[PDB]
Amino acid sequence: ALRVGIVYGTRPEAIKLAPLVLALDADPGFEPVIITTGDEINELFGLRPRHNLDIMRPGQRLSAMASRIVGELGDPLLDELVDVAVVQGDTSTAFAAAYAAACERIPVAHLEAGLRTGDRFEPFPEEINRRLITQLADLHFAPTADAAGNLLAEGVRSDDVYVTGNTVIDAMHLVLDNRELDAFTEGRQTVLLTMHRRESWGIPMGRVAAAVAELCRSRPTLRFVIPLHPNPEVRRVFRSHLSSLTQVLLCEPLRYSEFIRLMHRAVLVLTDSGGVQEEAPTLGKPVLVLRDRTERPEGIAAGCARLVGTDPALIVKEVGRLLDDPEAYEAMRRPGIVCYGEGDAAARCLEALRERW
Amino acid sequence: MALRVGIVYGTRPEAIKLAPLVLALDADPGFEPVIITTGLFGLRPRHNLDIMRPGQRLSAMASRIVGELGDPLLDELVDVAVVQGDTSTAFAAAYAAACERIPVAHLEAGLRTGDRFEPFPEEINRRLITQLADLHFAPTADAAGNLLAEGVRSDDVYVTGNTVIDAMHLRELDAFTEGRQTVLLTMHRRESWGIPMGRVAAAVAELCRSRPTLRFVIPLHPNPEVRRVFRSHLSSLTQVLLCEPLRYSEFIRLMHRAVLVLTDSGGVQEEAPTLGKPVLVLRDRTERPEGIAAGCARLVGTDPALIVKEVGRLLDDPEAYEAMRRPGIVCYGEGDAAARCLEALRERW
Ligand code: NA
Ligand code: NA
C-alpha cells in the first residue's frame, strides 16, 4: 500500500489536509502517515499524528524554523517508509518539508498549487514559498484552471498538474455535521465581523466601530456578532464603542466549529482575515474586506469580495447595498462558490495518486 | 558607504568562477565585496563556517547553512548576496539571504539539461536559486531563454557571459611533456569503473604503439579499483605518465600545454575548450551538450577504435584540429563577464 506522508505545522494546513487524510484512510490503496512541525483540530477531524517534531514557536526567526524542519523531517519520513510526501498551501512548513523530502529523493505532491498574486515578496514569505514548492513538487493539486495555468508559466509539465479543486468546502461541511450565539442570531440578518490584524488595531477599529453604530441606528432588524481580540488593550476599543448596543454581540475568541457555524448562519462577512476571505464565499457569504489590499485578489476579480478599507461611510453604503439590493447580493454570492475551487477535491487527489502510483 | 556585496561559496569551482567578480568588486569604488564561505586568487574571507564535510547528508548541510548564514550577512551589513552555479551552498545561501530580505544575484544562471533530478541535486538547485534570485547573470542567450520559461521577468536577466576564461588566465611532468604532443586523460565516473577503463587503456596502448612521438598524462582517481586497471595496462608504457591527483594550478598549466583532452568530467568539458583544447568525452552522453553542437567536443564513449580514430584525425589534420579549437573559448559564454556583472549591479542598485 502506498505510504503517503502528510506534513503540516498550523491549523489552516490541518483543516485543508483533513479531508485528504480521511479519504486516504478509507481507501485501501493508501496509508496516510501524519508528521507535524507545530490538537483542537486533530480531535475535530480524527487526525492521529505519528510524529510531533515541536519545531514552531511564536516570534521564531524564519531561518531557525526552516533549518530545524530541513534538518529533522528526513529521518521520520525514512523510518515510516513514506513513498510520497503531501504538503499544503504557501506555508514555510510546506516549503521546508518539501525540500527535506526532496533531499531523501521522496516525491512531493502539493495540495492547493498555482495561486499567484503576481506581486514578488508580497506577502513574505508566502509568495516565494509558493514558487519554491512548485519547483520541488512532482504532483500539483491546483484548485482551479487559472492556478493550473500559473504552474505552466513556471515550467511545470501538463501531466504533473491536476485541477483537483479545494478541500476547504469539504472540511467545513465535516464540522457542520452555541449558547446565546444561536439565540442572538435566530430570525435576524446577522453580520459576522472579524478584525484581528496589527495594522487594524486602535484608530481603524474605532472607524469600523462607528460604521457598525451607524448601520445599527439606521437598520433596527440588523444584528452583528464581533469576536473580541485576546489582547485587553485591543478589545478595549470595540467594548468602549459597541457594548451598550443591543444589536451587537461582543463574544470571546471562537473555537473553529462555533466560528464556521456562525459564519454559515451570517448574511454577510466583514473581515481583515485572508482565511475568512476564502471560507465565507465558499459557504455563499458575500465578503467586505476591512483593508486597502488583500492576499486573496481572486475573490476581488470574481466579485465575491470587495475592498472597503476602514472608511465608515463606504462600510455603511456597501453593507446597505447588499441588504437592500437582492441583485447586488447575488452578484457577490454566485461567483463565491467555484472562485476558490470545486468541492469533493480529496477524491480527485486520490485518482491522480492512483494514476501516477 | 559602498554597496556591500555578499559573496558566498563552499567549493573550489564556485570560488574559481566568483574570483574575477570579487577582484572587479574590490577595484570599483561603488562596491565592497564581503566573502562568507560554507566549506591563489587573493580572496580574503571575512567569515569561514566549517559546515561542509565529505559524505555528510545534504539535509544536514542545507540546515546548517540556512540556520547560520543570516547573522554574518546582517553583522556585515550586506546589501546584496551573490551565489554561483548549481551547488547546494548557492541554494541554501540564497534562501538564508531571502529570509533576512537581502536581494540575491545569481552568477551562471539558466543552464538546463532538460533531465529532471539528473544530476541530483544540481538540477533542482538551479530551479530553486532561479525563484529566489532578483538578478540573473546568464552566460548565454539560450540560458536567458530558460529563465523566461520559468517565469523570470526580462528586466532581471542579463547576458553577462562566463567568468571562467578570466579566472584561468590569472618539474618531473614538465620534463615528461616538454617538446612532445601531450594528451590529458581524466577518468573518474562510477559507470566507467573496471571494463570500460580497460577499453580506454587499450586505446591509449594502440595510439602509443602507432605514434612513438605521442605522450599521455593520466591523473589516477583515489579509488583503488580505478588505479588497478590503468596500472595493469599502462604502467609498462614509457609514453604514459600515471600521476597523483593534481593541484589546480599544475592541472590548468598541464591542460594549457596539452594538445587535446580526454575526460568524463563536466567541469573539464567546460574548461578545456575555453583554453582552446579540443575535447573527446569518454561517455555515451554529456551534461555539456553545447560543446557537441559547437563542435569543440565529441562523444567517444569508451570505444577503443573510435578513440584511436578521433585522436588520430586531430593529431594529423591541422584543419580538423582548428575546426574543434576555434568554436571553443567562447562556446560557454563570452569573457570580460565580471565587468558586465558590475554594470548590471550598478544599474539595478
Ligand atoms: Na487506507
Ligand atoms: Na570596492
Author numbering:
A (entry chain A): 2 to 39, 46 to 184, 191 to 370
B (entry chain B): 1 to 39, 51 to 181, 192 to 370
Verbatim from the authors:
Here we report a structural and functional analysis for an epimerase, KasQ, that primes KSM biosynthesis rather than the previously proposed KasF/H, which instead acts as an acetyltransferase, inactivating KSM. Our biochemical and biophysical analysis determined that KasQ converts UDP-GlcNAc to UDP-ManNAc as the initial step in the biosynthetic pathway. To better understand the catalytic mechanism of KasQ, we solved crystal structures of KasQ for the wild type (WT) and its complexes with UDP or UDP-Glc in resolutions of 2.44 Å, 2.58 Å, and 2.09 Å, respectively. In brief, each monomer consists of two domains (N-terminal and C-terminal domains), in which each subdomain is made of a typical sandwich (αβα) architecture of a Rossmann fold.
In consistence with homodimers in solution, an asymmetric unit contains two monomers colored in rainbow (N-terminal blue, C-terminal red) and gray. Superimposition of these two monomers with an RMSD of 0.86 Å for 317 Cα atoms indicated no significant conformational differences. Two fragments marked in dashed lines (residues 40–45 in the N-terminal domain and residues 184–190 in the C-terminal domain) are missing from the model due to lack of electron density, likely a consequence of structural disorder/flexibility in loop regions. The N-terminal domain is constituted by residues 1–170 that fold into a central seven-strand β-sheet (β1–β7) sandwiched by α-helices (α1–α7) on each side along with a stand-alone α16 helix (residues 357–370). The C-terminal domain is formed by residues 201–359 composed of a central six-strand β-sheet (β8–β13) sandwiched α-helices (α9–α16) on each side. The N-terminal and C-terminal domains are connected by two helices, α7–α8 (residues 173–199). The cleft between these two domains provides the substrate binding pocket. A sodium ion was observed in coordination with the carbonyl backbone of N-terminal residues Leu25, Asp26, Asp28, and Phe31.
